[PDB]
Amino acid sequence: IIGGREVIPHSRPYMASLQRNGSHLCGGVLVHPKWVLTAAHCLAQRMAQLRLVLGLHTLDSPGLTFHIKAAIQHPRYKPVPALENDLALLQLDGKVKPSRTIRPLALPSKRQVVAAGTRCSMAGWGLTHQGGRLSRVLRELDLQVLDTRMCNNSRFWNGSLSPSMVCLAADSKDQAPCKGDSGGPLVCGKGRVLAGVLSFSSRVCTDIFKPPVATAVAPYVSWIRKVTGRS
């Protein structure tokens, strides 16, 4: 996150850090004691060396660490140039007992619509400057949902954002999630509700003609359910 502020330590107990040899790759949100929802494009990886770390603020510090028993990509997932259905569900090789620092974020209803204008945030440990290095500490950013017809404008996403994608804006020119931030949960509204999962941008994180975009959770709540076995 470029231009975010540090979170209060442990104020977002649902954050996961998906890592490869203790090196952080993407965020993820904990949607059940045994499952973390992240972005599919994060998993283009040798799974043996992957770990989920839970309960974190400082990135180099223990936290609760889990092995992954199964990485389930959305069935209709298409990578770049498509980058469609960019979700994957990671299964923990243990089971979380909720606590003060580790706790799951609830799913939205399937009927939830994320209307333009919605006030949201987005936490992540990703880069804090173009070309730079990951954040030492979990940070956050305020994001407003823009109108999709308008992000699809030829100068912006030029037609390529589908109904399941939520287009986003900071308050400023110079704030943007960035390398390392995908998989992070977009939460919206007063009651801080799960709304999306970060997916992509363009190469320059703050590019104003390429607002960041996340995948709405609601349209995939059903699948999340079937996969996680609950209802």
């Binding site: 770049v80 140039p81 960019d86 390398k179 997916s199 941008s201 960041p212």
Partner: peptide, 4 residues
């Protein structure tokens, strides 16, 4: 699209 550069995925993050």
């Amino acid at each position: 699209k550069v995925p993050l």
